[PDB]
CSV table of C-alpha atoms in Angstrom, one decimal:
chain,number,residue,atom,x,y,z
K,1116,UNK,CA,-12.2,-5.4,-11.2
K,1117,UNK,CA,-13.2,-9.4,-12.0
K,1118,UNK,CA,-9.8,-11.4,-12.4
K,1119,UNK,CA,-7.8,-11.8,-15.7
K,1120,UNK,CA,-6.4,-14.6,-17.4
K,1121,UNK,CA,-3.0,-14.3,-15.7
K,1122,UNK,CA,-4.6,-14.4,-12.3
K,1123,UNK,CA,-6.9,-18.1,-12.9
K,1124,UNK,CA,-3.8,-19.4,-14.8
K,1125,UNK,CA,-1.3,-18.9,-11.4
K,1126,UNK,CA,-4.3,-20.2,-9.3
K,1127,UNK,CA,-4.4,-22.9,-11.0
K,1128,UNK,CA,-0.7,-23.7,-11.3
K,1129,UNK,CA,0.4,-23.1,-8.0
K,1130,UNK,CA,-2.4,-25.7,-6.5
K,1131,UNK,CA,-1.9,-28.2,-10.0
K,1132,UNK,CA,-0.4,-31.0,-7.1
K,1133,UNK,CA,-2.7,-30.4,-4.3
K,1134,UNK,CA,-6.2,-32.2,-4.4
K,1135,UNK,CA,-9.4,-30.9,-3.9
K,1136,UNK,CA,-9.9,-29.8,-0.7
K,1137,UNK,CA,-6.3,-29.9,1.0
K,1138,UNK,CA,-5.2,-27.3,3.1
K,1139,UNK,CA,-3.1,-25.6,0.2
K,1140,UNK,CA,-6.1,-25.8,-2.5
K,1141,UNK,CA,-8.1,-24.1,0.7
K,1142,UNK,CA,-6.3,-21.6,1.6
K,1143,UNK,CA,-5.4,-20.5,-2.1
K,1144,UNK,CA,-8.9,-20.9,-2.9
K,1145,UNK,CA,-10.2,-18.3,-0.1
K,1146,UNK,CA,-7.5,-16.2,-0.7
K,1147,UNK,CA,-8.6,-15.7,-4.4
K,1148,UNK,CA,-12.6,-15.7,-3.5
K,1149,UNK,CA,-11.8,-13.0,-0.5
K,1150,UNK,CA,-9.9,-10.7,-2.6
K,1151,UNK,CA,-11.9,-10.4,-6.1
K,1152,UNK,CA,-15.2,-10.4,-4.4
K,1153,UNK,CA,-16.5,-12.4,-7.0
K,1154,UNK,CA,-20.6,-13.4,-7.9
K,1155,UNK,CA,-21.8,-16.8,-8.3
K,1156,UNK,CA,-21.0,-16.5,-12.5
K,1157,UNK,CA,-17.1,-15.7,-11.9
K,1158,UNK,CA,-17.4,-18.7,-9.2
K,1159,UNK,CA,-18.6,-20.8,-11.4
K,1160,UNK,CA,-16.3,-20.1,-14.3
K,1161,UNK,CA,-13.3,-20.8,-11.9
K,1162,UNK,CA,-14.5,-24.5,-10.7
K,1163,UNK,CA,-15.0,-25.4,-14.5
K,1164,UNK,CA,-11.3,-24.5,-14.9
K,1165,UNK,CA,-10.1,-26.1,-12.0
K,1166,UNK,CA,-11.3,-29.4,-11.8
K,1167,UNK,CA,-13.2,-31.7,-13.7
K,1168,UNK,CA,-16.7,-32.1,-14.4
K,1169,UNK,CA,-17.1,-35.1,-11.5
K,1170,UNK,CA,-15.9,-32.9,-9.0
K,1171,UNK,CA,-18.2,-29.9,-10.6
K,1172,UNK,CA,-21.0,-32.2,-9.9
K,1173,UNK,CA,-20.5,-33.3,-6.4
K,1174,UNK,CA,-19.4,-29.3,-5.7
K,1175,UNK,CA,-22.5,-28.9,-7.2
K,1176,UNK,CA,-24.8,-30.8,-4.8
K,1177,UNK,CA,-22.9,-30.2,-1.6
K,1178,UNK,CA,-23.2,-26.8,-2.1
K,1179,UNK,CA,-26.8,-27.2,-2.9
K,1180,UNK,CA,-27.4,-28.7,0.5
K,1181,UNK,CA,-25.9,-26.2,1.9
K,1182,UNK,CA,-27.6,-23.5,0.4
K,1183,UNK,CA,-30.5,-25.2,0.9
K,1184,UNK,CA,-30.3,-25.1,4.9
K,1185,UNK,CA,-28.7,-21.9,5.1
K,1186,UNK,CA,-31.6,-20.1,2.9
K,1187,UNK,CA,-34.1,-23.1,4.6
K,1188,UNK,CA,-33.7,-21.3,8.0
K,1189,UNK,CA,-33.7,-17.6,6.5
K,1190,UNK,CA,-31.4,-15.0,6.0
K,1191,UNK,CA,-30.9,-11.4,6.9
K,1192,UNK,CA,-30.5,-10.2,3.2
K,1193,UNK,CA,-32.6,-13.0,1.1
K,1194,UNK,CA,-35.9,-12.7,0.1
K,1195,UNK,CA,-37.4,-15.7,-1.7
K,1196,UNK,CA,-40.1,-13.9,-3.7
K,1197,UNK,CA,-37.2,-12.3,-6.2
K,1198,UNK,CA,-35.3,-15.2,-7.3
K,1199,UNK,CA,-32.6,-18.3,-6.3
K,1200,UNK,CA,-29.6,-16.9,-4.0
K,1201,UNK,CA,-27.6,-18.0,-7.3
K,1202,UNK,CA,-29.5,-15.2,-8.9
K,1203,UNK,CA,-29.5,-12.6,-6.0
K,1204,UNK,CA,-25.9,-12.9,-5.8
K,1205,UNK,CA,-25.6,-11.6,-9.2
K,1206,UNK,CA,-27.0,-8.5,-8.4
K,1207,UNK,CA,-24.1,-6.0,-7.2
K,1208,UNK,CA,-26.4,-4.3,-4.6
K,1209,UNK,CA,-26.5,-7.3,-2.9
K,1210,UNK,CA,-23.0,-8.1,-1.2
K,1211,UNK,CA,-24.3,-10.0,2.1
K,1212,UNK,CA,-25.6,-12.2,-0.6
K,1213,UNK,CA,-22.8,-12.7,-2.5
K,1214,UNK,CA,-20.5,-12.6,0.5
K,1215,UNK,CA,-23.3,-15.8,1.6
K,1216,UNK,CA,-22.9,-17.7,-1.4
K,1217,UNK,CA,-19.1,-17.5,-1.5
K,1218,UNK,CA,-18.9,-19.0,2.1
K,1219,UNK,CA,-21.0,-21.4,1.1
K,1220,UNK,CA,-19.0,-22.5,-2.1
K,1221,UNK,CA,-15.8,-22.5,-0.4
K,1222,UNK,CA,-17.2,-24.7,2.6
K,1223,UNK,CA,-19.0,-27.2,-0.1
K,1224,UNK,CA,-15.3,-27.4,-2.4
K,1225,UNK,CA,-14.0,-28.1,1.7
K,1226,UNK,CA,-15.9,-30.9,2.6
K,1227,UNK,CA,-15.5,-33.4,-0.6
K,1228,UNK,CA,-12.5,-35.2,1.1
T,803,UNK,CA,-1.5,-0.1,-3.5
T,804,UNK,CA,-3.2,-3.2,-1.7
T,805,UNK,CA,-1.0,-6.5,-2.9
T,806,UNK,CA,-2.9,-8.4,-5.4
T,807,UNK,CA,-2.9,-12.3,-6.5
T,808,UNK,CA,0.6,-12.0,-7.9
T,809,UNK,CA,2.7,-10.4,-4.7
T,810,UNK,CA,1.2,-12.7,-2.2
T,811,UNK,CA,1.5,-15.7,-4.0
T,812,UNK,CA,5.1,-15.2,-4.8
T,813,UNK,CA,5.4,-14.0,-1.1
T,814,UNK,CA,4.4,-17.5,-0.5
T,815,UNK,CA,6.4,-19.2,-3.1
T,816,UNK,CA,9.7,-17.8,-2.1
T,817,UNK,CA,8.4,-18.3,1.8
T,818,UNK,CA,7.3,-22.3,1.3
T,819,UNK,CA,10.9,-23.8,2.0
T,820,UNK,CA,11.5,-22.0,5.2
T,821,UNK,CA,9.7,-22.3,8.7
T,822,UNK,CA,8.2,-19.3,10.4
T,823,UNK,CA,10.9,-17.7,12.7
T,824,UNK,CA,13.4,-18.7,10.7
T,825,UNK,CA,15.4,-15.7,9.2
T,826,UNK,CA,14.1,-16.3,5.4
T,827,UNK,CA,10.5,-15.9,6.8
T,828,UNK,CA,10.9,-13.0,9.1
T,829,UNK,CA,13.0,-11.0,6.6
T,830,UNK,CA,10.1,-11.6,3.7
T,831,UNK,CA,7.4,-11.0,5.7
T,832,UNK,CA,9.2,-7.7,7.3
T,833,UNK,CA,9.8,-6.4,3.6
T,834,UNK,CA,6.6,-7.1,2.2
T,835,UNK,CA,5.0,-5.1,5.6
T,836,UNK,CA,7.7,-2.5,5.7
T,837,UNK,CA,6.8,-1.8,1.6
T,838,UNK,CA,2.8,-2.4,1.4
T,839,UNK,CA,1.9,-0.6,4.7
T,840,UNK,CA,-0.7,-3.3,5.0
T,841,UNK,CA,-3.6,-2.8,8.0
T,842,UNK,CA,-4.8,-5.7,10.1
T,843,UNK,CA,-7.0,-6.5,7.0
T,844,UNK,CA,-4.4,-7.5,4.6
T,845,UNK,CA,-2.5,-9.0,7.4
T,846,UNK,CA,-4.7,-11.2,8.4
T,847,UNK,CA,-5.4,-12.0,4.8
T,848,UNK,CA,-1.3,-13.0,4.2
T,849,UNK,CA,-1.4,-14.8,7.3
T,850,UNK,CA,-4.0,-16.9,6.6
T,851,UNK,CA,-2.4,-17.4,3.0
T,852,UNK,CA,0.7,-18.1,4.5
T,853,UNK,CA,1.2,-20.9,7.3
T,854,UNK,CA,-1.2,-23.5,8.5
T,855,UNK,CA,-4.2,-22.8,11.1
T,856,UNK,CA,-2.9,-24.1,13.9
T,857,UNK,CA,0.3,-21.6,13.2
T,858,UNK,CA,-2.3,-19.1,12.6
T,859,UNK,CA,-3.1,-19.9,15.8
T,860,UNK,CA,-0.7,-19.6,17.5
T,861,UNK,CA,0.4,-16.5,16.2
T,862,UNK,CA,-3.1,-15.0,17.4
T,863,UNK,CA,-2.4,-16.1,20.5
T,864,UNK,CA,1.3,-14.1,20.6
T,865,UNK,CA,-0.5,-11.3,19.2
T,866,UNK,CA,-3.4,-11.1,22.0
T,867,UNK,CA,-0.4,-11.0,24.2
T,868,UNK,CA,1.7,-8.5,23.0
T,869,UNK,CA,-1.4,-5.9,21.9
T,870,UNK,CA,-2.8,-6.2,25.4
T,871,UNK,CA,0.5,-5.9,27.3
T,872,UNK,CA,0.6,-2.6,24.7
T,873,UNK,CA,-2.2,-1.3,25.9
T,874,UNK,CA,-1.9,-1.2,29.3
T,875,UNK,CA,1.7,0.5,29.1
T,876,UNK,CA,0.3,3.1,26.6
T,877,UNK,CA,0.2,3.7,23.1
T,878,UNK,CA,1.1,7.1,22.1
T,879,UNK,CA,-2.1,7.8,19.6
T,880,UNK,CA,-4.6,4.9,20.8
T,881,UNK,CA,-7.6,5.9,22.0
T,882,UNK,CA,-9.8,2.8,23.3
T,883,UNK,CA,-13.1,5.3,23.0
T,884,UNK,CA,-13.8,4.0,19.7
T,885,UNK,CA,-12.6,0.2,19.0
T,886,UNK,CA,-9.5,-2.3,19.6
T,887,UNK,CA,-6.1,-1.6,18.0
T,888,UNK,CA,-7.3,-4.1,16.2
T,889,UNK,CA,-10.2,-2.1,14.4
T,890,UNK,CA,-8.3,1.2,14.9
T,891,UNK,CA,-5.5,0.1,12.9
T,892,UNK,CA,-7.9,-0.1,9.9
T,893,UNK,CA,-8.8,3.6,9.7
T,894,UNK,CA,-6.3,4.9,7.0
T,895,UNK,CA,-6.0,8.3,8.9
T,896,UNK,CA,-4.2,6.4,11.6
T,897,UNK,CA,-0.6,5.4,10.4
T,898,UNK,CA,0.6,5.1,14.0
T,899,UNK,CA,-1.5,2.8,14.9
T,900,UNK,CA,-1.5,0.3,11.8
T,901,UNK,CA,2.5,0.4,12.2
T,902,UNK,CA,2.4,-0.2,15.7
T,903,UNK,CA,0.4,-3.3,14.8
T,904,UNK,CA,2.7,-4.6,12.0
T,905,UNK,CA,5.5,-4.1,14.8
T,906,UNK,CA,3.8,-6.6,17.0
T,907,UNK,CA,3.0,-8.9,14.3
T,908,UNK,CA,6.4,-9.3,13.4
T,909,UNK,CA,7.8,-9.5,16.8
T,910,UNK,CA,4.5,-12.3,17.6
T,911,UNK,CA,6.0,-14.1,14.2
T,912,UNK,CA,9.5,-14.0,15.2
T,913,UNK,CA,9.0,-15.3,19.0
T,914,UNK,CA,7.1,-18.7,17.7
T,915,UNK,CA,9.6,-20.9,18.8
């Protein structure tokens, strides 16, 4: 049950004032990446249509940080020898992974202001 | 017949101009409860959507107060031999329970100020 056109466009158009990070672009945001349960794909596909490439980029290394520390330290669910957590999150027998990565992304898209 | 992206986010579009306690936001918020049945999940969920943390908060706060007084005068169907009202109100074969809990939310809203 991945999300529809209809669904990104409102997303997008209710948060179109807001910048990145505010409390209405975060709480929007969560509300969309709690209730879809969403991969790392989907994710991905949804910052490209939201904002621009400059703030895919820095999205993109916060979050790499991030993932980096988390994964650094070691995690219940992920085990290195069978690919990146952008890759294990993929797999839909994997949820605390995917539930990981989406806490991660929406912590990284919070922290750019 | 969990809300999806459209219900909420018009619950919050027709809920933005208003201040919670005010009648506009109790009435919405008791129609969309009174017609969705919704569980402490989805609650939580709209909550969060809804107001900012602090009111979030806050309303926590009201809530811990009015489900503990609860429980020590007696619920008619809550047994504390398995989990909280708070996780007992997310079994579906408990209807008492989850209305009980939508009561309290509402009345926690409405006493804000």
């Amino acid at each position: 049950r991945p999300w529809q056109m209809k669904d990104l466009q409102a997303i997008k158009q209710e948060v179109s004032q807001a910048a990145p990070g505010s409390p209405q672009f975060m709480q929007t945001i969560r509300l969309a990446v709690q209730q879809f349960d969403p991969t790392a794909k989907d994710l991905q596909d949804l910052l490209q249509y939201l904002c621009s490439s400059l703030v895919a980029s820095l999205h993109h290394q916060q979050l790499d940080s991030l993932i980096s520390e988390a994964e650094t330290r070691g995690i219940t669910g992920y085990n290195p020898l069978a690919g990146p957590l952008r890759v294990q999150a993929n797999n839909p027998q994997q949820q605390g992974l995917r539930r990981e990565y989406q806490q991660l992304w929406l912590a990284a898209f919070a922290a750019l202001p």
